[PDB]
């Protein structure tokens, strides 16, 4: 699953962690097996304004 | 997003991989470092099992 999030919200994608993006529009289990890969990309997403 | 946002407000692209291990018909796995061939010497071989 690929998408884009904010900076201080990368912490909410973790097993068993509650928040505002995890509890409202994307939530992964507490018994999750796999892993996550995030690399800062604000060179292709931020516009002037 | 704008190019003046702090690192906490910057966009971040993220990919999460979710596996499955229960009853799996192994379909996606493989390094398979290919055997270099040796001839005419009594050698330990293991061809595809």
């Amino acid at each position: 699953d690929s998408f884009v999030i904010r900076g201080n919200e990368v912490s909410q994608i973790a097993p068993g962690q509650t928040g505002n993006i995890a509890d409202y529009n994307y939530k992964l289990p507490d018994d999750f097996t796999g892993c996550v890969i995030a690399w800062n990309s604000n060179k292709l997403d931020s516009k002037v304004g | 997003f704008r190019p003046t946002y702090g690192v906490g407000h910057q966009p971040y692209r993220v990919v999460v991989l979710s596996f499955e291990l229960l009853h799996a018909p192994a379909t996606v796995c493989g390094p398979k470092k290919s055997t270099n061939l040796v001839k005419n010497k009594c050698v330990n071989f293991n061809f595809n099992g």
Partner: antibody
Amino acid sequence: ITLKESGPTLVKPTQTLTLTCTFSGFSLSTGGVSVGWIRQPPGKALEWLALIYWDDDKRYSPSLESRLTITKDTSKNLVVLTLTNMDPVDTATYYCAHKTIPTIFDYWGQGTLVTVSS
Amino acid sequence: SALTQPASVSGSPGQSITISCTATSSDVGAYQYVSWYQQYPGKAPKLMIYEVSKRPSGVSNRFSGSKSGNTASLTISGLQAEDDAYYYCNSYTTSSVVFGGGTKLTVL
């Protein structure tokens, strides 16, 4: 990478000035890439004009917006800026540069001198 | 008003010189990306440095940026007569990219 501006060198008061910027080596289809226009009066500092993103999200200068609709065509690699209501202030150089998010204006063009008088 | 650049500086050939692009305007945003552009005498501007403390590979080793707060002290070591040209700075504000008042660099 190359860009090139073109258009009328001379123009009369209150007329529609048109300019065509032809580029080669890159396109306006990849993410992040955009192309904007900038002018510089003779012996003066630069100024912004407009900006057209690759997704057809467009930006104009705040003070002089609601005009100069900048369109483009990435098929023949051409961007077009057209600004109406010629004033004698509008006599300046004009450049069409490709803009990235960190490397602001990394690919500039040539520039065309335009005069506003009888 | 938004940015600010000095009129001119004149350094003897073979020495160092630093140039400042003070903003002299509050709330230019985070002031993290600050680029400098080299304006030739009547030629298309060439990018000299972007990401102030960075410098793009392909140019000399004398230009170097810094930030003393609200300005960018771009430094140039070993001044040679080739460095005579015009200079501008560029950094986004909260609403839109802004430019400097212009700077002249004459080697003497």
